[PDB]
Ligand binder design. Structure first.
Ligand SMILES: NCC(=O)NCC(=O)NCC(=O)O
Ligand SMILES: [Ca+2]
Ligand SMILES: [Ca+2]
Length: 278
């Protein structure tokens, strides 16, 4: 399948070179997989989700995405026009309030919820979780992310936006999950993206067009935008059967475009997520 005039990051994950604008992908499109977006919520009624989005848990007095951030991330995972995996199932877990903030206890609770919930959902091709959030280092946060991975979920996490080493942030610093840095349309690591040996992969994160609340769209930047590219790619590869949750990060790293990025500090991977279509 081919989506012409796609957002630049979708085109980039299906190309070996920057500057193209068609997103090429297998029509299976992540059907039968599921991605939990652990964030501010998801506006499930948004037409771009085509009924494939559902809120499953909130830690606040409403499950509504009153911010937009979670809806944006979900759209990069799986919306019709802005998504990597255009037929996956999206599940929303609201751990951040409508200012985009959350206590570590709440983030841990949300991860634990996904660990115990996902086998009760219709996800024959596998389960991903996208964590477009983080804070300062916490052993308990890292442990919860590692247990979520070990429960059978492909966990993708944002590296963080400090232009610093991701080993000082959580859950980015948990080695057993997939830690995602951000790039711009010219194949440069994004100005704000964290780096370091703990990064597994980079994906598009600067000026990412996706869904927004109110049935709308918005372009924003961050490692929170790169993470859902990887989560959606994992869902897509799991539906094709080329990997499973346990090996998905390593498989994505091994099949990535290698050496294409600039502004990559020595010792950080130079790997850009790539779907190997065509
Ligand atoms: N104490 C952790 C926290 O609340 N982090 C805020 C956060 O990650 N918001 C989403 C983002 O900035 O990517
Ligand atoms: Ca290249
Ligand atoms: Ca890792």
């Amino acid at each position: 399948a081919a989506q012409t005039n796609a957002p630049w990051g979708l085109a980039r994950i299906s190309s070996t070179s920057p500057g193209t604008s068609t997103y090429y992908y297998d029509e299976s499109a992540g059907q039968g997989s599921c991605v939990y977006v652990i964030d501010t919520g998801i506006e499930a009624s948004h037409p771009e989700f085509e009924g494939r989005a559902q809120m499953v848990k909130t830690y606040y007095y409403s499950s509504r995405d009153g911010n937009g951030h979670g809806t944006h991330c979900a759209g990069t995972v799986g919306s019709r026009t802005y998504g990597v995996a255009k037929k996956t199932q999206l599940f929303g877990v609201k751990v951040l309030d409508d200012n985009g903030s959350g206590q570590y206890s709440t983030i841990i609770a949300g991860m634990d919820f996904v660990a115990s919930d996902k086998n009760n959902r219709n996800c024959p091709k596998g389960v991903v979780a996208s964590l477009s959030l983080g804070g300062g280092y916490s052993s308990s946060v890292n442990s919860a992310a590692a247990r979520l991975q070990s429960s059978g979920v492909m966990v993708a996490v944002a590296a963080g936006n400090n232009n610093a080493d991701a080993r000082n942030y959580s859950p980015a610093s948990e080695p057993s999950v997939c830690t995602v840095g951000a790039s711009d349309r010219y194949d440069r690591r994004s100005s704000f993206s964290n780096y370091g040996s703990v990064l597994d992969i980079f994906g598009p994160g600067t000026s990412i067009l996706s869904t927004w609340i109110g049935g709308s769209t918005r372009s924003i930047s961050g490692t929170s935008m790169a993470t859902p590219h990887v989560a959606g790619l994992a869902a897509y590869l799991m539906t094709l059967g080329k990997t499973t949750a346990a090996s998905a990060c390593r498989y994505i790293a091994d099949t990535a475009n290698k050496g294409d990025l600039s502004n990559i500090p020595f010792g950080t991977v130079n790997l850009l997520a790539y779907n190997n279509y065509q």
